[PDB]
């Protein structure tokens, strides 16, 4: 990966990050009370809010239920503890690898799950936003209720036949709002929805304001709850669910990471360059992975990026074409360019105190000393340090330079207009039909250059006939 040489067609390494992989996945358990608890006593009042919200979050979770059920019915992990073997995966119908992985993790968590739903009665009757779940002075985990705090702060100490409508109103408000938010993250599309991942998004919905407390509680680490809540390291799998109690057990995994050595992930941005009288930019991957002499396109989409680090749980590398590699590795005659409509924002960056600009599409005016800086055609973009200028101006934006670049250049860079391609499907599809046309010109041309041959070969046959007759009439002369 030759960066030095790549900066001479505007290709700027914005930041260099270290790649991360997971050694083991630290875990914790979570019970979600879907129904809030009442401490107030109810008399001569049928609170209609609840017999409905019950029915509906029950309907909403009926798939995840029947699936947790069908699977647990046909898991059967032989011995498990220690290392066992899962039996009868055909129960999943068709499944992907990530789905099968989760199918087995469901089976392991089975125990800790049942251990938790064992105590559903306690958990239900307990009134808290965030309670501990205890058995034998050990914690099986945390149980949460996203609205309880809010319920507590609003019901009458006593529900009477006077309070009825007014209570069943504002309970309904709170209930039906949380029910609307559950109706996003719980649409059922697929065949084994129990196995579906719970995003850090779906989690913020389920736990509500309880989330920060649970993150501080469920995991202990050098990681701050700040960066832990903010990134997307956290993930969950539904591992247990009782409908009648509306309690839903969720395994939550925080992966322990470590550097993968001799690998870097480098983001590439491109300023505009001036080459063969067009304003273009390099056509390269915006971020690649580099291990030794290997290079691939590394878009970290779902992945967790930080100033010095990328954690990809997954791996979505794309392969790089032969020119593209060549391009990245020094041979600039294989870099591919494309016309762009430059702009101030896209026509220069700033690198450790030095200016890499396209000083031709854009005006580079030096202040000390003041001389409009012209960019030669043998230079696609322009480097600017202390020597070329101690005080730059650019439009309204002005600054000084203390920085000096290590020479390390030695001109020049020759690139043919054939390195300037369409990158657009339509543009390309057009350039293709053109070549096809040209090729049909060369086909009709051949068929025509083959009628000439048939001619010429036939004129040679006449010359042979003439020659057989002369040479024979010479034999006729025997004297």
Residues at the site binding ligand NAG, with contacts judged by CB under 6 A: 35, 54, 124, 244-246, 431, 433, 435-437, 440
With CB under 5 to 8 Å by kind, the binding choice for 329 among a copy of itself, ligand NAG, none is none
**Closer residue to ligand NAG, CB minimum distance, 435 or 455:** 435
* Contact residues for 271 (Cβ-Cβ < 8 A; gap 6+): 10, 12, 281, 346, 347, 348, 349, 356, 357, 358, 381
Q: Are 443 and 408 in contact (CB under 8 A)?
A: no
Closest approach of ligand NAG to the CB of residue 226, in Å: 14
With CB under 5 to 8 Å by kind, the binding choice for 174 among ligand NAG, a copy of itself, none is a copy of itself
Place of tokens 């039906």: 176
**Closer residue to ligand NAG, CB minimum distance, 179 or 257:** 179
Q: Please name the helix (run of DSSP H) or strand (run of DSSP E) that holds residue 296, with its range, or none.
A: strand 294-297
With CB under 5 to 8 Å by kind, the binding choice for 264 among ligand NAG, a copy of itself, none is none
With CB under 5 to 8 Å by kind, the binding choice for 344 among ligand NAG, a copy of itself, none is a copy of itself
What is the torsional sign of CA 102, 103, 107, 113? positive
Q: Please name the helix (run of DSSP H) or strand (run of DSSP E) that holds residue 32, with its range, or none.
A: strand 11-33
Q: Are 130 and 210 in contact (CB under 8 A)?
A: yes
Closest approach of ligand NAG to the CB of residue 193, in Å: 21
* Cα 93–Cα 95–Cα 98 angle in degrees, nearest 5: 155
Q: Are 273 and 347 in contact (CB under 8 A)?
A: no
* Contact residues for 262 (Cβ-Cβ < 8 A; gap 6+): 291, 292
Q: Please name the helix (run of DSSP H) or strand (run of DSSP E) that holds residue 294, with its range, or none.
A: strand 294-297
With CB under 5 to 8 Å by kind, the binding choice for 11 among a copy of itself, ligand NAG, none is none
**Closer residue to ligand NAG, CB minimum distance, 116 or 359:** 116
**Closer residue to a copy of itself, CB minimum distance, 121 or 454:** 454
With CB under 5 to 8 Å by kind, the binding choice for 246 among ligand NAG, a copy of itself, none is ligand NAG
**Measured between alpha carbons, how far is 55 from 35 in angstroms, rounded to an integer?**
11
**Closer residue to a copy of itself, CB minimum distance, 51 or 138:** 51
Closest approach of ligand NAG to the CB of residue 434, in Å: 6
**Closer residue to a copy of itself, CB minimum distance, 45 or 115:** 45
Closest approach of ligand NAG to the CB of residue 233, in Å: 26
């Amino acid at each position: 990966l030759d960066l030095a040489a790549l900066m001479q067609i505007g290709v700027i390494p914005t930041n260099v990050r270290q790649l991360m992989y997971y050694t083991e996945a630290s875990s914790a358990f979570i019970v979600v009370k879907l129904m809030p608890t009442i401490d107030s006593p109810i008399s001569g009042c049928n609170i209609t809010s609840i017999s409905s919200y019950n029915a509906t979050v029950t309907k909403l979770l009926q798939p995840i239920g029947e699936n947790l059920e069908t699977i647990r019915n046909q898991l059967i992990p032989t011995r498990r503890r220690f290392a066992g073997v899962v039996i009868g995966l055909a129960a999943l119908g068709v499944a992907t690898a990530a789905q099968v992985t989760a199918a087995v993790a469901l089976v392991k968590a089975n125990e800790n799950a049942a251990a938790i739903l064992n105590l559903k009665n306690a958990i239900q009757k307990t009134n808290a936003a965030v309670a501990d779940v205890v058995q034998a002075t050990q914690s099986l985990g945390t149980a949460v209720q996203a609205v309880q705090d809010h319920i507590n702060s609003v019901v009458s100490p006593a529900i009477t036949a006077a309070n009825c409508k007014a209570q069943d109103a504002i309970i309904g408000s709170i209930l039906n709002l949380y029910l609307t938010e559950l109706t996003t993250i719980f649409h059922n599309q697929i065949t084994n929805p129990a196995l579906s991942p719970i995003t850090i998004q779906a989690l913020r919905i389920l736990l509500g304001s309880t989330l920060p407390t649970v993150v501080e509680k469920s995991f202990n680490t050098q990681i701050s709850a700040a960066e832990l809540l903010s990134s997307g390291l956290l993930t969950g799998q539904i591992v247990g669910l009782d409908l009648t109690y509306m309690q839903m057990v969720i395994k939550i995994e925080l992966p322990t990471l470590t550097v993968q050595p001799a690998t870097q992930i480098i983001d590439l941005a491109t300023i505009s360059a001036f080459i063969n009288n067009q304003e273009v930019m390099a056509q390269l991957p915006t971020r690649v992975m580099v291990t030794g002499s290997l290079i691939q396109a590394y878009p970290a989409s779902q992945c967790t990026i930080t100033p010095n680090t990328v954690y990809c749980r997954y791996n979505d590398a794309q392969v790089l074409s032969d020119d593209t590699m060549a391009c990245l590795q020094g041979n600039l005659t294989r870099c591919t360019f494309s016309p762009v409509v430059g702009s101030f924002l896209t026509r220069f960056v700033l690198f450790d105190g030095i200016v890499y600009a396209n000083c031709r599409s854009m005006l580079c005016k030096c202040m000390q000393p003041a001389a409009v800086i012209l960019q030669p055609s043998s230079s696609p973009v322009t480097v600017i340090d202390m020597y070329k200028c101690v005080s730059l101006q650019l439009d309204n934006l002005r600054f000084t330079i203390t920085q000096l670049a290590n020479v390390t250049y030695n001109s020049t860079i020759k690139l043919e207009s054939s390195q300037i391609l369409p990158i657009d499907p339509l543009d390309i599809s057009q350039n293709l039909a053109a070549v096809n046309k040209s090729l049909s010109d060369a086909l009709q041309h051949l068929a025509q250059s083959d009628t000439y041959l048939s001619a010429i070969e036939d004129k040679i046959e006449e010359i042979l006939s003439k020659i057989y007759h002369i040479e024979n009439e010479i034999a006729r002369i025997k004297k």
